[PDB]
Design a protein around this ligand. Structure first.
Ligand SMILES: [NH3+]C1(Cc2ccc(Cl)cc2)CCN(c2ncnc3[nH]ccc23)CC1
Ligand SMILES: [NH3+]C1(Cc2ccc(Cl)cc2)CCN(c2ncnc3[nH]ccc23)CC1
Lengths: 337, 20
């Protein structure tokens, strides 16, 4: 049973959650190659592990910047959660460590680039293409939510395409283990459920709403709620009036009305029958959930691979030195990292 | 067209996370 698979999956998770791995490498073990992306409290770099010659993506977080942005507890969540999970569509954390200045998370390198890049370039995905990605997210959230985790930042910028054309969810910066309700305003404006905007307690249902936004964005090529400033996006979301492209199939529209549902008693994912309302929807009738999980389905798109350590599927970013202070910064705040 | 309006908007690039 999936119930039973997930039961056992939780026992595995809980062991790692209660006794987290810590300090499993050192910066000098890696050669830094190139910046793959950036964010407010740091960057992600392509690196090579000298001892194996394996290439990895190393997220580097400046501890002082994390403190300023009030992301201490969120960063601790991120690392504690990522070291404990195990699912085909979650990027693996290979190593983590810290030094005087920074925290480091060394993860598997996903060479095909961001969904975002391919989506913007190509314009939109066919319904079958979008459905293939959406299925992987459906299974992933089923997994995460069974572990009492809320993910809270679904978007194409953090969905990387692997060499087999399947999705890797990266980034867990807003992921949280919580039974019941939570309150933090976090996420990306276009993907926020109305509950978050309206500053209510929310739960894992915000992830199912975010799935609706993702599917719409993939199939249409633009999100259901856009504007030039975030405040204008929020006004649109809380209306929740959604218009669909004339090219959207009738099933796709019906799935999205039930995901992008302001009414929690009515939002798919949130009902008595849980994820199965989604999995059994007509739009997914052709999806073989076991073959998706097994990675037996032929991907609609396979990214270009010129070689190992190739970054051609990634944009170029300004390179900045990794400076390590001779004085320890913020030791107490990140003691458990 | 909605596509034209999107492409002309300021939010076709990578979108930053927000937090309170
Ligand atoms: N979008 C990213 C960078 C990013 C942007 C914003 C924030 Cl808040 C966090 C990270 C996400 C990780 N990634 C990446 N690329 C390749 N292989 C990987 N393996 C793990 C992560 C990555 C590079 C782009
Ligand atoms: N029982 C499975 C694992 C399995 C069993 C036998 C073989 Cl030969 C291969 C794999 C079948 C796929 N899957 C799964 N299926 C449907 N919904 C899900 N949600 C999370 C995981 C899954 C995870 C368990």
């Amino acid at each position: 049973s999936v119930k039973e698979f997930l039961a056992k999956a939780k026992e595995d998770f809980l062991k790692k959650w209660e006794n987290p791995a810590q300090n499993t490498a050192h910066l000098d073990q890696f050669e830094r190659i190139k910046t793959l992306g950036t964010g407010s409290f740091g960057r992600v770099m392509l690196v090579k592990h000298m001892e194996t010659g394996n290439h990895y993506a190393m997220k580097i977080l400046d501890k002082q910047k994390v403190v300023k942005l009030k992301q201490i507890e969120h960063t601790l969540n991120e690392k504690r959660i990522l070291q404990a999970v195990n699912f085909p569509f979650l990027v693996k954390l290979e190593f983590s460590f810290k030094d005087n200045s920074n925290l480091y998370m060394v993860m598997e390198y996903v060479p095909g680039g961001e969904m975002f890049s391919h989506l913007r370039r190509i314009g939109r995905f066919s319904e079958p293409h979008a459905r293939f990605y959406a299925a992987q997210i459906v299974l992933t959230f089923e997994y995460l939510h069974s572990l009492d985790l809320i993910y809270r930042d679904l978007k194409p910028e953090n969905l990387l395409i692997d060499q087999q054309g399947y999705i890797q969810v990266t980034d867990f910066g807003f992921a949280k283990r919580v039974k019941g309700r939570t309150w933090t305003l976090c996420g990306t404006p276009e993907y926020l459920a109305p509950e978050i905007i309206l500053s209510k307690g929310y739960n894992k249902a915000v992830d199912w709403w975010a799935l609706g936004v993702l599917i719409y964005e993939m199939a249409a090529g633009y999100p259901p709620f856009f504007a030039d400033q975030p405040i204008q996006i929020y006004e649109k979301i809380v209306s929740g009036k959604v218009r669909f492209p004339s090219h959207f199939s009738s099933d796709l529209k019906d799935l999205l009305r039930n995901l992008l549902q302001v009414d929690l008693t009515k939002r798919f994912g949130n009902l008595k029958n849980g994820v199965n309302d989604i999995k059994n929807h007509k739009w997914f009738a052709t999806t073989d959930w076991i073959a998706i999980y097994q990675r037996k389905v032929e991907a609609p798109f396979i990214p270009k691979f010129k070689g190992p350590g190739d970054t051609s599927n990634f944009d170029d970013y300004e390179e900045e030195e990794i400076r390590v202070s001779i004085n320890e910064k913020c030791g107490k705040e990140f003691s458990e990292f | 067209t909605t596509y034209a309006d999107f492409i002309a908007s300021g939010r076709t690039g990578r979108r930053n996370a927000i937090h309170d």
